[PDB]
Design a protein around this ligand. Structure first.
Ligand SMILES: Cc1c(C)c2c(c(C)c1O)CC[C@@](C)(CCC[C@H](C)CCC[C@H](C)CCCC(C)C)O2
Ligand SMILES: Cc1c(C)c2c(c(C)c1O)CC[C@@](C)(CCC[C@H](C)CCC[C@H](C)CCCC(C)C)O2
Ligand SMILES: Cc1c(C)c2c(c(C)c1O)CC[C@@](C)(CCC[C@H](C)CCC[C@H](C)CCCC(C)C)O2
Ligand SMILES: Cc1c(C)c2c(c(C)c1O)CC[C@@](C)(CCC[C@H](C)CCC[C@H](C)CCCC(C)C)O2
Ligand SMILES: [Cl-]
Ligand SMILES: [Cl-]
Ligand SMILES: [Cl-]
Ligand SMILES: [Cl-]
Ligand SMILES: [Cl-]
Ligand SMILES: [Cl-]
Ligand SMILES: [Cl-]
Ligand SMILES: [Cl-]
Lengths: 231, 231, 231, 231
């Protein structure tokens, strides 16, 4: 039985001081006003999952990182708030951090920003921006080994400019923007494992999303106990 | 179920600051270049165990300390490196630290240096010397209550002189050198519990080594999980 | 008979202080833990040479620099480690530094990074990165007048980002990245002397590699004496 | 052809600064008033050699150090001065430093002080004492890995007390005093290689001295060229 504090050690290469600072932030970061709740039950965001907003690839990248996929077009800003969408990432992260190999090799996330609207940007306030930067850098026990943005419209750079100043130099080096002709570049970073929609060979995004939705629903009892352990 | 961090508390008389510093070193000490691996499976050093290099007494000393015995003559430096020999002590220590009474009363080690050669000393580099001093003082959650050297040849003092400068005043007070006429002195420190070869009454070293070898092999599954919890 | 210390003078335009600092680093740089051995015998890396990984052009560039060619596709990371590959450059450098005209006009290296894999990047640790930067700047008596990277995949920039912070401003100005359409740009820097595979007119890479392999094997006695003069 | 400055590098583990300081002292140390001459021709001390004062063992110690033997009883202070006796060590040192394996593994010297008289001590002035300490520590490119004194009379400690304050902590750790029952202790440091007179099995001191005397006489042309290269 790995202690709860072991994931923080692995996240900081067993540097006790650094892991301590990470744990401190992990308990404080969401309490930043206006706070996001510690509620991690999928009932409030099951609609997002069924809309096909989010999924996790079955296979890891060539360095062992778990690969996450987000499709912004499947987020209706009139139905779900940024906090709801944020909650989806929290739920997923709390689940995949259980894997030791994820703890060691980190994660990489792919954001399909095709269909990004001003209504989306309206949700991203400075306070939200700060929280995004927090979990990317030093507030959650997951190594962010790479962030890949594809199909980014020109209007998105305003949003990213809100997040940028709160980002460390390390994470900034790991943020990639591919544009519309992403497939060649994206395939080089993720051989053999991408879905059909992004240059892959086997699985479709619909299947990948449905699989991860089932896993989240399946884990709703574990997600409840996590919620009660941070309040 | 005692938490993993309780053995560090007991090792420092429940001084939270001091136990914290010990845990920090416990995760860092082996990473000192050139590093020793976190691998604790007995497969790589089963030869040493079967050669009769190492054993643990069945009974404790009058103060409750576990008593460890090392015979340097049973270490062939042409077959096993200093790192392999070091690994044997790591494996044994990770096992006996599970006993609460060992956590409270510490350990005492007896090194039979009869048969110490220059080929042995060749293995003990300055880096190795530093690591020896580290686990003796502040890098492993075991109180070193005594170190007893017997049958030490005159050429050994060069080796000890490498270790000495990195030793604290407390541990230095606890290092004894008996020479060839050790039996009278050694019996006073360890009544009733020594093997036949060292003035004892009952058990032989061959039996003691065979018993501890079986226990190590028996614990190979626990030793694997420890290895995976420090990387 | 040119003294051994003359190549360090020529490398620093007969600035005695600067040449002294270079000689100091030349003796210390490989001892950085984890150290690379001073062994320069081609027996350990003959496989790399026969695989066509490395060769030296017969003719010099328009400024008199010796031109070196490396093909990363001919390096199998499952057979040869980064240290083995590093050793190949050490061996070549120790040979060409014997030429006075190379001492005066320096060298230029061309790295064909076509076929660069994550398995290659796995070998390039931070410690290795530091050593690469060391021999590029101030640890070997060869003026690096230019480094040319061709056919670089997008995933390589992560590796280069490890090396970059340890690079001086001078050397950084001398690192070129051409991409896939390199031929026009590469021909302007190296007229008349390139192999067929890179826009040249006469010789093939296979011939160039075979010629330099023979020369290395031919010089194995000189390479042994160098090894014994740095330990 | 190893440069003359390579022996200073090997003597200081290729630390360029430290080797530089050693070379500086090597040229200055004998010039300390009252100076000893740079003359290294055996003609002035052939009498000492034929008297059986000095010899070098054919075999090295278990660590590769050259082993030197001095017999103070064969020094007649009424015939040869301390400077003459000092010259013998200079001559021997300049010869054995030519061996690369001696440069790497250093030397160990055995002084048989049986027959030490006050007439001997009369020769050892404070200035002489300082010079003895100089060549032991930082004025000659030979690592002193050990000094062994045997058969030392009680009156010798006055002489050693003159040398002691000018000795570094490192060298002081390497000075052994065995007394009259030296054989057991001396054999442990030098197995298989000692002469008959000191617990050995094969060769006698008379043979060892005669062999080294021939070698010195044989090298008189090399010793002349060394003398002319330090003035
Ligand atoms: C532990 C962890 C969390 C919790 C996490 C992410 C990652 C990589 C993590 O490791 C990435 C996404 C994020 C920050 C949730 C983002 C919430 C907003 C609403 C997403 C849509 C708008 C973003 C402007 C789109 C770009 C996001 C990238 C700049 C990361 O939640
Ligand atoms: C937690 C712990 C470890 C890990 C440990 C020891 C003790 C008492 C511990 O509590 C004692 C032995 C040691 C340091 C391994 C020593 C490895 C070398 C190769 C032993 C042979 C050579 C030594 C020069 C012999 C003398 C050793 C004493 C000076 C300790 O490993
Ligand atoms: C004196 C000298 C040495 C010794 C040398 C080089 C040069 C130009 C020298 O002048 C260039 C190559 C290098 C640094 C060996 C590199 C070893 C690694 C394994 C090469 C493959 C991976 C590299 C990441 C590829 C890019 C290299 C460039 C950034 C230089 O060895
Ligand atoms: C490079 C080198 C030299 C040059 C050298 C020695 C050694 C080990 C060297 O490595 C040892 C002997 C010495 C210092 C010459 C000594 C001269 C006197 C006259 C010897 C007789 C009286 C001594 C009081 C006897 C004890 C000597 C030990 C304390 C070294 O010359
Ligand atoms: Cl909320
Ligand atoms: Cl990219
Ligand atoms: Cl190892
Ligand atoms: Cl005692
Ligand atoms: Cl190596
Ligand atoms: Cl260019
Ligand atoms: Cl004189
Ligand atoms: Cl002794």
């Amino acid at each position: 039985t790995d202690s709860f504090l072991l994931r923080f050690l692995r996240a900081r290469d067993f540097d006790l001081d650094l892991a301590w600072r990470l744990l401190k932030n992990y308990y404080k970061w969401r309490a930043e006003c206006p706070e996001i709740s510690a509620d991690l039950h999928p009932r409030s965001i099951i609609g997002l999952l069924k809309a096909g907003y989010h999924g996790v690839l079955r296979s890891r990248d060539p360095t062992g990182s778990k690969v996450l996929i987000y499709r912004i077009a499947h987020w209706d800003p009139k139905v779900f708030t940024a906090y709801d969408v944020f909650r989806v990432s929290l739920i997923t992260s709390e689940l995949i951090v259980q894997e030791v190999e994820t703890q060691r090799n980190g994660i990489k996330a792919i954001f399909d920003l095709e269909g990004w609207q001003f209504s989306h940007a309206f949700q991203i306030t400075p306070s939200v921006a700060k929280k995004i930067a927090a979990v990317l850098t030093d507030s959650f026990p997951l190594k962010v080994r790479g962030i890949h943005l594809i199909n980014e419209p020109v209007i998105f750079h305003a949003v990213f400019s809100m997040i940028k100043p709160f980002l460390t130099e390390k994470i900034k080096e790991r943020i990639h923007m591919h544009g519309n002709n992403y497939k060649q570049s994206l395939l080089q970073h993720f051989p053999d494992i991408l879905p059909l929609e992004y240059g892959g060979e086997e699985f479709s995004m619909e299947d990948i999303c449905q699989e991860w939705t089932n896993f989240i629903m399946k884990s709703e009892d574990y997600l409840s106990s996590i919620s009660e352990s941070i309040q």
